[PDB]
Design an enzyme around this catalytic site. Structure first.
Site, PDB file in Angstrom:
ATOM      1  N   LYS A  47       0.822  -1.190   0.000  1.00  0.00           N
ATOM      2  CA  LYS A  47       0.000   0.000   0.000  1.00  0.00           C
ATOM      3  C   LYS A  47       0.866   1.253   0.000  1.00  0.00           C
ATOM      4  CE  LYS A  47      -3.551   2.395   2.741  1.00  0.00           C
ATOM      5  NZ  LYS A  47      -3.741   2.620   4.224  1.00  0.00           N
ATOM      6  N   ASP A 162      -8.677  -2.018   8.712  1.00  0.00           N
ATOM      7  CA  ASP A 162      -9.448  -0.767   8.589  1.00  0.00           C
ATOM      8  C   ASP A 162      -9.008  -0.199   7.213  1.00  0.00           C
ATOM      9  OD1 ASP A 162     -10.248   1.796  11.158  1.00  0.00           O
ATOM     10  OD2 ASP A 162     -11.208   1.403   9.256  1.00  0.00           O
TER      11      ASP A 162
HETATM   12  C1  LIG Z   1      -6.367   4.535   7.709  1.00  0.00           C
HETATM   13  C2  LIG Z   1      -5.993   4.005   9.067  1.00  0.00           C
HETATM   14  C3  LIG Z   1      -5.465   4.902  10.006  1.00  0.00           C
HETATM   15  C4  LIG Z   1      -5.122   4.432  11.272  1.00  0.00           C
HETATM   16  C5  LIG Z   1      -5.255   3.059  11.551  1.00  0.00           C
HETATM   17  C6  LIG Z   1      -5.762   2.152  10.619  1.00  0.00           C
HETATM   18  N1  LIG Z   1      -5.903   0.855  10.993  1.00  0.00           N
HETATM   19  N2  LIG Z   1      -6.397   0.493  12.094  1.00  0.00           N
HETATM   20  C7  LIG Z   1      -6.388  -0.870  12.160  1.00  0.00           C
HETATM   21  C8  LIG Z   1      -6.899  -1.709  13.374  1.00  0.00           C
HETATM   22  C9  LIG Z   1      -5.653  -2.220  14.125  1.00  0.00           C
HETATM   23  C10 LIG Z   1      -7.704  -0.851  14.359  1.00  0.00           C
HETATM   24  C11 LIG Z   1      -7.751  -2.935  12.969  1.00  0.00           C
HETATM   25  C12 LIG Z   1      -5.836  -1.336  11.016  1.00  0.00           C
HETATM   26  C13 LIG Z   1      -5.515  -0.222  10.271  1.00  0.00           C
HETATM   27  N3  LIG Z   1      -4.960  -0.141   9.011  1.00  0.00           N
HETATM   28  C14 LIG Z   1      -5.127  -1.031   7.966  1.00  0.00           C
HETATM   29  O1  LIG Z   1      -5.833  -2.027   8.074  1.00  0.00           O
HETATM   30  N4  LIG Z   1      -4.446  -0.822   6.822  1.00  0.00           N
HETATM   31  C15 LIG Z   1      -4.554  -1.439   5.625  1.00  0.00           C
HETATM   32  C16 LIG Z   1      -3.513  -1.562   4.716  1.00  0.00           C
HETATM   33  C17 LIG Z   1      -3.758  -2.112   3.425  1.00  0.00           C
HETATM   34  C18 LIG Z   1      -5.027  -2.536   3.019  1.00  0.00           C
HETATM   35  N5  LIG Z   1      -5.239  -3.058   1.758  1.00  0.00           N
HETATM   36  C19 LIG Z   1      -5.101  -4.343   1.410  1.00  0.00           C
HETATM   37  C20 LIG Z   1      -4.486  -5.276   2.253  1.00  0.00           C
HETATM   38  C21 LIG Z   1      -4.351  -6.613   1.877  1.00  0.00           C
HETATM   39  N6  LIG Z   1      -4.797  -7.023   0.696  1.00  0.00           N
HETATM   40  C22 LIG Z   1      -5.400  -6.158  -0.147  1.00  0.00           C
HETATM   41  C23 LIG Z   1      -5.841  -6.635  -1.377  1.00  0.00           C
HETATM   42  C24 LIG Z   1      -6.465  -5.769  -2.270  1.00  0.00           C
HETATM   43  C25 LIG Z   1      -6.635  -4.422  -1.969  1.00  0.00           C
HETATM   44  N7  LIG Z   1      -7.238  -3.614  -2.862  1.00  0.00           N
HETATM   45  C26 LIG Z   1      -6.190  -3.919  -0.738  1.00  0.00           C
HETATM   46  C27 LIG Z   1      -5.577  -4.797   0.175  1.00  0.00           C
HETATM   47  C28 LIG Z   1      -6.091  -2.391   3.927  1.00  0.00           C
HETATM   48  C29 LIG Z   1      -5.840  -1.819   5.202  1.00  0.00           C
HETATM   49  C30 LIG Z   1      -6.151   2.638   9.353  1.00  0.00           C
END
Ligand SMILES: Cc1cccc(-n2nc(C(C)(C)C)cc2NC(=O)Nc2ccc(Nc3ccnc4ccc(N)cc34)cc2)c1
Ligand SMILES: CCCCCCCCO[C@@H]1O[C@H](CO)[C@@H](O)[C@H](O)[C@H]1O
Length: 335
Positions: A47, A162
């Site tokens: 990402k 998220d």
């Molecule tokens: C925006 C943001 C800011 C602060 C925290 C988060 N955040 N919070 C959490 C938890 C611990 C509270 C559950 C997790 C996050 N961030 C997060 O999950 N990041 C994330 C990174 C990459 C992705 N994308 C993908 C991740 C994995 N596979 C993918 C496949 C296809 C595709 N189009 C996207 C993905 C989704 C989320 C997210």
């Protein structure tokens, strides 16, 4: 020592990544490529953060996400495999790339393709709760749980993430009511809504707006009691509630026709209006519904997490230096 990077242009966007990551292919919108981690063998999602230091809101968000993901170490929560920048110094630091396990589908795709068996719902809701026990034990509230924030692989293994269908549909009523405070059990309400949808194939509360959203909710759970009215701090919210034509609580058995009665009972304990009375993730894991999965020796809690750091009032340049430090200090996971 800094790895060799290679540049390439994809989907209207530059990408400079260590040679460790090969065959970058876009998977949508920051923006994300699928890749092969030549080092570990794994298929990864890379990402590229979108304009991470654009503003104090972006800079703070970038810092918060990096700091959080670095701290999340649990089977049912997204974890960080890697974080990098092609910049060799703070002065040239503008870009942040996060790397995680590639994910196939989200829960939406499973319920929008199907309606699930009770056996399958047990396992999926079990895992969401197990990841939430962990998140919650760190004093972190997710606040945006919904099917698309849940990655599910071919083995039905689930991870909470998220990514950033209306969020409102899964939101606890106290958020509809703009409550200033709310506890961890806002996330339990959402699990309740998700579990309902997985069992019926229909959105439980498909509100068109926030007032409609409360209407549809109160229709099932009933209008607040005199015990709950006493707990409303807002004079304006309090008036609105008292102005309503009382609706009785529905019998969930009479609504979730055909579902396992233990699933129904669990739903009754999650979709309680009074959040003080809502079941917690740790109590939920011990409900009879999860009898075949529950293991009090294998539902771990998280190390304590300091939220004050991401909440300060700093300059963009300062958040930027703080994020750089977090990149530099990353220690990868054991493979
Ligand atoms: C925006 C943001 C800011 C602060 C925290 C988060 N955040 N919070 C959490 C938890 C611990 C509270 C559950 C997790 C996050 N961030 C997060 O999950 N990041 C994330 C990174 C990459 C992705 N994308 C993908 C991740 C994995 N596979 C993918 C496949 C296809 C595709 N189009 C996207 C993905 C989704 C989320 C997210
Ligand atoms: C019509 C919608 C009624 C809203 C009731 C939601 C639960 C109210 O209950 C309250 O929840 C608050 C938020 O966590 C907390 O400040 C209190 O601990 C709790 O008493």
């Amino acid at each position: 020592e800094r790895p060799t990077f290679y540049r390439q242009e994809l989907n209207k966007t530059i990408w400079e990544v260590p040679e460790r990551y090969q065959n970058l292919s876009p998977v949508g919108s920051g923006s994300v490529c699928a890749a092969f981690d030549t080092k570990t063998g794994l298929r990864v999602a890379v990402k590229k953060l979108s304009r991470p230091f654009q503003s104090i809101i972006h800079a703070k968000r970038t810092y918060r996400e990096l700091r959080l993901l670095k701290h999340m170490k649990h089977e049912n929560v997204i974890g960080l495999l890697d974080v990098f920048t092609p910049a060799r110094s703070l002065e040239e630091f503008n870009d942040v790339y996060l790397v995680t396990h590639l994910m196939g589908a989200d829960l939406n795709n499973i319920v929008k393709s199907q309606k699930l068996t009770d056996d399958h719902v047990q396992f999926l809701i079990y895992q969401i709760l197990r990841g939430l026990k962990y998140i919650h034990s760190a004093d972190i509230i997710h606040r945006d749980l919904k099917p698309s924030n849940l990655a599910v692989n071919e083995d039905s293994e689930l991870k909470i993430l998220d990514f950033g269908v209306a969020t409102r549909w899964y939101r606890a009523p106290e958020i509809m009511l703009n409550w200033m405070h709310y506890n961890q059990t806002v996330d339990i309400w959402s699990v309740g809504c998700i579990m309902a949808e997985l069992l019926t194939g229909r959105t439980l509360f498909p509100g068109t707006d926030h007032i409609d959203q409360l209407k549809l909710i109160l229709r099932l759970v009933g209008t607040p009691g005199a015990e709950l009215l006493k707990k409303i701090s807002s004079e304006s919210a309090r008036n609105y509630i008292q102005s309503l034509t009382q609706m009785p609580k529905m019998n969930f058995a009479n609504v979730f026709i055909g579902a396992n009665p233990l699933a129904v009972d669990l739903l009754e304990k999650m979709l309680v209006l009074d959040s003080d009375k809502r079941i917690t993730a740790a109590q939920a894991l011990a409900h009879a519904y999860f009898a075949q999965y529950h293991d009090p020796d294998d539902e771990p809690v998280a190390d304590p997490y300091d939220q004050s750091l991401e909440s300060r009032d700093l300059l963009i340049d300062e958040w930027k230096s703080l994020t750089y430090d977090e990149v530099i200090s990353f220690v990868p996971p054991p493979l």
